[PDB]
Design a protein around this ligand. Structure first.
Ligand SMILES: N[C@@H]1[C@@H](O)[C@@H](O)[C@@H](CO)O[C@H]1O
Length: 134
């Protein structure tokens, strides 16, 4: 892996599916997937998906003008150190649906306009095998 970025300079529309395949390293503490509204530093985050192995939670949030919004959490932690995982982030008209493995995990309703998303960035403690956008 590596702090991985995929620019989407022309944006995305409902019906776009982000498929991330990878592995949580043995001593991982946390990793994240951000759908950002620009390439500049401090850009708003339409979505911050943050599995935290250290605190056993998975947090969802948005970032606007530098401030994080209200945190949402899914049930438990469907990730485990030393194991492979597959996540689908689906963009629909009303939000992003997150699927982990074979289960629907959480539905995050849009906070910022989907039309503003211009970049996908994956970072933290994660071994990335592939990131596809369908
Ligand atoms: N430092 C973390 C950020 O990295 C982000 O995960 C936000 C999510 O709300 O929580 C903060 O406490």
């Amino acid at each position: 892996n590596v702090p991985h970025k995929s620019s989407l300079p022309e944006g995305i529309r409902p019906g776009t599916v982000l498929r991330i395949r990878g592995l949580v390293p043995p001593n991982a503490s946390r990793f994240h997937v951000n759908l950002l509204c620009g390439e500049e530093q401090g850009s708003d985050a339409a979505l911050h998906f943050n599995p935290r192995l250290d605190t056993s939670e998975v947090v969802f949030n948005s970032k606007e003008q530098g401030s994080w919004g209200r945190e949402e959490r899914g049930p438990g932690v469907p990730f485990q150190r030393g194991q492979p995982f597959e996540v689908l982030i689906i963009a629909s008209d009303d939000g992003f649906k997150a699927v982990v493995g074979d289960a629907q995990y959480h539905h995050f309703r849009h906070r910022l306009p989907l039309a503003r998303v211009r970049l996908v960035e994956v970072g933290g403690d994660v071994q990335l095998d592939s990131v596809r956008i369908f």
